[PDB]
RNA sequence: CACCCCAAUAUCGAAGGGGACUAAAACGACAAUCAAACUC
């Protein structure tokens, strides 16, 4: 359980009626110099006396609440059935059941039910008694355990009258099962039931009772009993506190508790302690590790421990069959006999700690087995043996590594304090948390700097023939343009004044951009700290060019009517109503907390289809052309409804936000800024390990917005009249070019006010302008997440900026591809573009590139071209008209977009052949055309209900009910349709077969693959950045204790460690810190090597160019050059080792990566917890990933095998 | 194979507990298996 958690165990009397006892969650809060205890409820935040509190905790922990509690909530005849009477007697057994006792229907005859009524009571009464006796047992044996609920369960199951109850239930079931429709209606009814307050737990056990299609096992009933028993907090564990003999030792006991539980923590211990004792042990340890004196120092003490008897000593109890805390005794007892005593011995403090470290480590292994034994008894862990959890050889290796971690953490903790400059006297928990927040932002920012350097490398390359090596623009100067520049870049680069006319490099780029970028890169890295600092470099004129650049990208609204208002010309009327909404640009600050429109989109989609009235969608065109216009309007309506300012005094209507704040808050108390507090509370929950915290809050906001859409904008989805077209195509064309009739309906399009206030906002916005939307997204949301966590408004501007640069990026991509192009006469367009070698026509064609178009045509042609006589209609109307062939090219946007993309040719392989095979039934079959319109959804609708019906039921139950549904066709028929299951299964694979092909032919796989490359490389990027940060901690820590000597700072060197590039004085030249003499560095490098960090070239980090893991990842060569030289797996291995200096990071890498694929494979998390190298051997290894399931059911996904293998290829491919 | 931390502690019913303070998770532009009795 928990104190200072969600369990409410602490008890405070209710204010309205003093007698009533109300239960509260209580917490620790730092008051300034010390922790204090506050109650932690929205209603109450009162301080708690430490002394009152500790006693209550101890009192709470031993209280025999349970018997009074079980009776207080329950009595026979209210325990389940609520079959009760007694003529004014509240609870009793056996007596006094009052036995044999808008439309009203009374009928004759149903004699039998009276027979079953009694059956109810024989049921409920037996149950109450069964429990009472067990609670009545004694100690109890049952509730004195840590896994008490399970013991209760085994006792409940075993050798009890419960089995008769199953028989009674079955008997009740049998009469209902066949004989009377009424019997079922009634049999269910005598359950409370529906109204007051009831526990989902009960409803499901009812739902199993009222169902004869599913079997009922005695297990289902027992499980209900404990769950009901917990549900009402009747059942708790009885744990006796340490025994004490008089008040003076009781006083001492309660004081160390208050220390252990309320008073101290990592920081608090550090502050009080302890005349320099800790530093000495760590100093003691570092030397011993360097010496190699250590292993035998541990290896000997381990034997003092005498493990083998302990393994024997432990084994004996486990067979005793409790599977509990008694294990710690056998351990506690064993230590007492083998070890002192007190006489042995007066020993060095450093020596003593190895005993504590060893002791408490092995006490951690005693938890390993105990956790396992519970984890083997239920389902499968499974069946691991002590024998090789204690493994004196394995233990020796593990124990050593825990000693280096201890020694390491302390060094780093001091360094972290040092490098930041937090005062060692006031360190507290509150400061450390807000330091985490930025530390997280800092890792992201640096990675951001490192992608923009990757982008800059492509645009810019060294003048000399000699070096093809990376250019570190920041932290660095006679650059010359790269040979392979996109020419998309020059326009941005030219605009920025980075490039002089003729493409020669600008003066400004050297001071304005590079100088600022580096100083800014170093404020992040060096915890600077200061004025920031440029009085300084950068000016509004310099800045204004940036603002003007952002403004230029946006297409005007008038242009962005290629979503055909033909659609809306019905129906003109809603559009004026929306523009007519008045909003204020204040930004409110509520808006930040609401979901992205991307979240709400699907429901908006969902409703329009869900709405009954709308007609079937013709081909498509139309649906693509109807939804898209609708989505964009909804996207801009989502925003206007949020920014709407308060309505004028005579409107009945509620502004959307006001309805939302009213829904989330209780009635009559609607005076609050509750939106923010829900997000902030939901963000904290997520922090403490509730991953649904933020989705659950989101979907509320959505539900409420979807409501608001239905109530005020119903017509926008109400489309009684529509046509499949061409008539629409005609409509757009007939409409198009009636230039004299220029005017088209348009959405408001807002207005733009970009402003820059610092040099920092301007390097970032520039950087934003330089790399992909996927990347700017990651650091945007990190700007967001920090601002909320720290409750600052520093970053709000750059967010708005970064938002704008993005909405402009993805709208420009709306206009140009569909409208400016595609020309559709590609050989012609290439000569139309080559002739070319705000506005939409028109110039945005800059993005259009001749080489790319040629490539696009060529790759499509490869797909189209027939081999031999064998030719094809297939791919018709997908890539070509219709008619025919080369005359026109269809715009498969997914293919056209990107093709950046050094990767693309490499990435495309393993898609490219597979594209050719797929038949187009898209097209191809009326069945194929049919599958989309009626049926992709038909299944989704069917799976949905099944999921909803199922949820919260056990896997064991779901499994049979599911088998029963497969097995009995008549049972299956109700839900959903096309009974039986066999028929459904075939429609499922049918859609499963539509979606497989569809994904290849629009090349959805490029998107998935291109995403995998950036995420994986991005997290791996974070991680080298963490390592770099750590070295600063290691140096600072090593220095703060007097174990290393530094005479200087080489400011303007980012890195904390030096190269052997030298030749001499490299140590005081290479690194940010300055070392006194080789000895200093020679000692440093050695202490480091002790922890698994190899600082002597060439050691992974220092291999000359792109040979170090560091350089390969940090220069982003998994997105730009995949598969060259090294397997992605090879490299995932090689970082997972570079970080092996700190157990904290164990399988940090592996986990990090495979969650990039969580969505499209079925990760075995158990097997991701074990040790492994993917890269070497371990062919068997994935394994790590299993094919995806859904329908729960667990039906194989439309692309389960293909995607999972696609990934496998991706990682391993090494050519 | 998570990791760190909490005593009078080498060891003492810590057989307890803390952890935005630490990784992982989460978040992420465009984009899915998980009081009682009376009132209904």
mmCIF file of N, CA, C and O in Angstrom, chain A residues 171-204:
data_model
loop_
_atom_site.group_PDB
_atom_site.id
_atom_site.type_symbol
_atom_site.label_atom_id
_atom_site.label_comp_id
_atom_site.label_asym_id
_atom_site.label_seq_id
_atom_site.Cartn_x
_atom_site.Cartn_y
_atom_site.Cartn_z
ATOM 1 N N UNK A 171 -28.537 -24.419 -10.305
ATOM 2 C CA UNK A 171 -29.917 -24.830 -10.256
ATOM 3 C C UNK A 171 -30.763 -23.638 -10.624
ATOM 4 O O UNK A 171 -31.686 -23.741 -11.417
ATOM 5 N N UNK A 172 -30.415 -22.484 -10.080
ATOM 6 C CA UNK A 172 -31.168 -21.285 -10.371
ATOM 7 C C UNK A 172 -31.039 -21.026 -11.853
ATOM 8 O O UNK A 172 -31.989 -20.637 -12.519
ATOM 9 N N UNK A 173 -29.843 -21.250 -12.368
ATOM 10 C CA UNK A 173 -29.590 -21.049 -13.777
ATOM 11 C C UNK A 173 -30.428 -21.991 -14.626
ATOM 12 O O UNK A 173 -30.945 -21.605 -15.669
ATOM 13 N N UNK A 174 -30.564 -23.231 -14.185
ATOM 14 C CA UNK A 174 -31.245 -24.211 -15.009
ATOM 15 C C UNK A 174 -32.693 -23.842 -15.273
ATOM 16 O O UNK A 174 -33.151 -23.921 -16.403
ATOM 17 N N UNK A 175 -33.413 -23.423 -14.242
ATOM 18 C CA UNK A 175 -34.808 -23.048 -14.424
ATOM 19 C C UNK A 175 -34.932 -21.832 -15.319
ATOM 20 O O UNK A 175 -35.764 -21.784 -16.213
ATOM 21 N N UNK A 176 -34.083 -20.848 -15.068
ATOM 22 C CA UNK A 176 -33.987 -19.670 -15.911
ATOM 23 C C UNK A 176 -33.476 -20.068 -17.283
ATOM 24 O O UNK A 176 -33.916 -19.549 -18.305
ATOM 25 N N UNK A 177 -32.547 -21.010 -17.294
ATOM 26 C CA UNK A 177 -31.789 -21.303 -18.490
ATOM 27 C C UNK A 177 -32.747 -21.709 -19.573
ATOM 28 O O UNK A 177 -32.575 -21.350 -20.731
ATOM 29 N N UNK A 178 -33.755 -22.477 -19.202
ATOM 30 C CA UNK A 178 -34.741 -22.887 -20.177
ATOM 31 C C UNK A 178 -36.135 -22.384 -19.875
ATOM 32 O O UNK A 178 -36.716 -21.620 -20.637
ATOM 33 N N UNK A 179 -36.646 -22.809 -18.730
ATOM 34 C CA UNK A 179 -38.069 -22.921 -18.509
ATOM 35 C C UNK A 179 -38.899 -21.654 -18.580
ATOM 36 O O UNK A 179 -39.953 -21.650 -19.204
ATOM 37 N N UNK A 180 -38.440 -20.577 -17.959
ATOM 38 C CA UNK A 180 -39.229 -19.356 -17.964
ATOM 39 C C UNK A 180 -38.417 -18.142 -18.364
ATOM 40 O O UNK A 180 -37.364 -17.885 -17.798
ATOM 41 N N UNK A 181 -38.922 -17.371 -19.313
ATOM 42 C CA UNK A 181 -38.266 -16.130 -19.671
ATOM 43 C C UNK A 181 -38.281 -15.280 -18.429
ATOM 44 O O UNK A 181 -37.319 -14.596 -18.112
ATOM 45 N N UNK A 182 -39.391 -15.352 -17.716
ATOM 46 C CA UNK A 182 -39.588 -14.567 -16.512
ATOM 47 C C UNK A 182 -38.555 -14.929 -15.460
ATOM 48 O O UNK A 182 -38.078 -14.068 -14.733
ATOM 49 N N UNK A 183 -38.206 -16.203 -15.386
ATOM 50 C CA UNK A 183 -37.324 -16.663 -14.337
ATOM 51 C C UNK A 183 -36.010 -15.917 -14.430
ATOM 52 O O UNK A 183 -35.467 -15.481 -13.420
ATOM 53 N N UNK A 184 -35.500 -15.758 -15.644
ATOM 54 C CA UNK A 184 -34.277 -14.996 -15.846
ATOM 55 C C UNK A 184 -34.461 -13.538 -15.473
ATOM 56 O O UNK A 184 -33.608 -12.935 -14.844
ATOM 57 N N UNK A 185 -35.589 -12.972 -15.857
ATOM 58 C CA UNK A 185 -35.810 -11.568 -15.615
ATOM 59 C C UNK A 185 -35.807 -11.343 -14.124
ATOM 60 O O UNK A 185 -35.248 -10.373 -13.632
ATOM 61 N N UNK A 186 -36.432 -12.262 -13.405
ATOM 62 C CA UNK A 186 -36.519 -12.163 -11.957
ATOM 63 C C UNK A 186 -35.214 -12.530 -11.283
ATOM 64 O O UNK A 186 -34.763 -11.856 -10.364
ATOM 65 N N UNK A 187 -34.586 -13.590 -11.765
ATOM 66 C CA UNK A 187 -33.475 -14.162 -11.046
ATOM 67 C C UNK A 187 -32.434 -13.094 -10.960
ATOM 68 O O UNK A 187 -31.825 -12.891 -9.928
ATOM 69 N N UNK A 188 -32.258 -12.379 -12.053
ATOM 70 C CA UNK A 188 -31.335 -11.271 -12.066
ATOM 71 C C UNK A 188 -31.782 -10.183 -11.112
ATOM 72 O O UNK A 188 -30.972 -9.592 -10.417
ATOM 73 N N UNK A 189 -33.076 -9.918 -11.059
ATOM 74 C CA UNK A 189 -33.528 -8.699 -10.414
ATOM 75 C C UNK A 189 -33.151 -8.620 -8.945
ATOM 76 O O UNK A 189 -32.746 -7.559 -8.476
ATOM 77 N N UNK A 190 -33.224 -9.746 -8.255
ATOM 78 C CA UNK A 190 -33.022 -9.732 -6.830
ATOM 79 C C UNK A 190 -31.529 -9.647 -6.645
ATOM 80 O O UNK A 190 -30.895 -10.449 -5.967
ATOM 81 N N UNK A 191 -30.995 -8.613 -7.270
ATOM 82 C CA UNK A 191 -29.682 -8.084 -7.001
ATOM 83 C C UNK A 191 -29.928 -6.585 -6.983
ATOM 84 O O UNK A 191 -30.609 -6.075 -7.856
ATOM 85 N N UNK A 192 -29.414 -5.924 -5.971
ATOM 86 C CA UNK A 192 -29.279 -4.502 -5.975
ATOM 87 C C UNK A 192 -27.897 -4.352 -6.582
ATOM 88 O O UNK A 192 -26.892 -4.503 -5.880
ATOM 89 N N UNK A 193 -27.823 -4.108 -7.889
ATOM 90 C CA UNK A 193 -28.975 -3.850 -8.729
ATOM 91 C C UNK A 193 -28.690 -2.615 -9.528
ATOM 92 O O UNK A 193 -27.580 -2.449 -10.001
ATOM 93 N N UNK A 194 -29.681 -1.746 -9.665
ATOM 94 C CA UNK A 194 -29.498 -0.538 -10.437
ATOM 95 C C UNK A 194 -30.113 0.704 -9.847
ATOM 96 O O UNK A 194 -31.316 0.835 -9.896
ATOM 97 N N UNK A 195 -29.283 1.603 -9.317
ATOM 98 C CA UNK A 195 -29.735 2.864 -8.721
ATOM 99 C C UNK A 195 -28.699 3.561 -7.825
ATOM 100 O O UNK A 195 -27.884 4.337 -8.292
ATOM 101 N N UNK A 196 -28.762 3.278 -6.531
ATOM 102 C CA UNK A 196 -27.888 3.864 -5.529
ATOM 103 C C UNK A 196 -26.430 3.985 -5.944
ATOM 104 O O UNK A 196 -26.030 4.915 -6.638
ATOM 105 N N UNK A 197 -25.658 3.020 -5.463
ATOM 106 C CA UNK A 197 -24.218 2.870 -5.631
ATOM 107 C C UNK A 197 -23.864 1.396 -5.622
ATOM 108 O O UNK A 197 -24.281 0.651 -4.740
ATOM 109 N N UNK A 198 -23.070 0.984 -6.604
ATOM 110 C CA UNK A 198 -22.783 -0.425 -6.808
ATOM 111 C C UNK A 198 -21.428 -0.530 -7.460
ATOM 112 O O UNK A 198 -20.961 0.416 -8.074
ATOM 113 N N UNK A 199 -20.789 -1.679 -7.317
ATOM 114 C CA UNK A 199 -19.440 -1.847 -7.815
ATOM 115 C C UNK A 199 -19.412 -2.643 -9.098
ATOM 116 O O UNK A 199 -19.959 -3.735 -9.181
ATOM 117 N N UNK A 200 -18.755 -2.089 -10.099
ATOM 118 C CA UNK A 200 -18.561 -2.806 -11.341
ATOM 119 C C UNK A 200 -18.259 -4.263 -11.091
ATOM 120 O O UNK A 200 -18.710 -5.120 -11.822
ATOM 121 N N UNK A 201 -17.472 -4.545 -10.067
ATOM 122 C CA UNK A 201 -17.163 -5.920 -9.740
ATOM 123 C C UNK A 201 -18.431 -6.727 -9.656
ATOM 124 O O UNK A 201 -18.518 -7.811 -10.208
ATOM 125 N N UNK A 202 -19.428 -6.199 -8.966
ATOM 126 C CA UNK A 202 -20.663 -6.953 -8.827
ATOM 127 C C UNK A 202 -21.324 -7.166 -10.182
ATOM 128 O O UNK A 202 -21.636 -8.298 -10.526
ATOM 129 N N UNK A 203 -21.490 -6.096 -10.965
ATOM 130 C CA UNK A 203 -22.231 -6.181 -12.248
ATOM 131 C C UNK A 203 -21.721 -7.312 -13.139
ATOM 132 O O UNK A 203 -22.511 -7.982 -13.809
ATOM 133 N N UNK A 204 -20.405 -7.514 -13.147
ATOM 134 C CA UNK A 204 -19.818 -8.535 -13.990
ATOM 135 C C UNK A 204 -20.200 -9.922 -13.465
ATOM 136 O O UNK A 204 -20.520 -10.795 -14.261
#
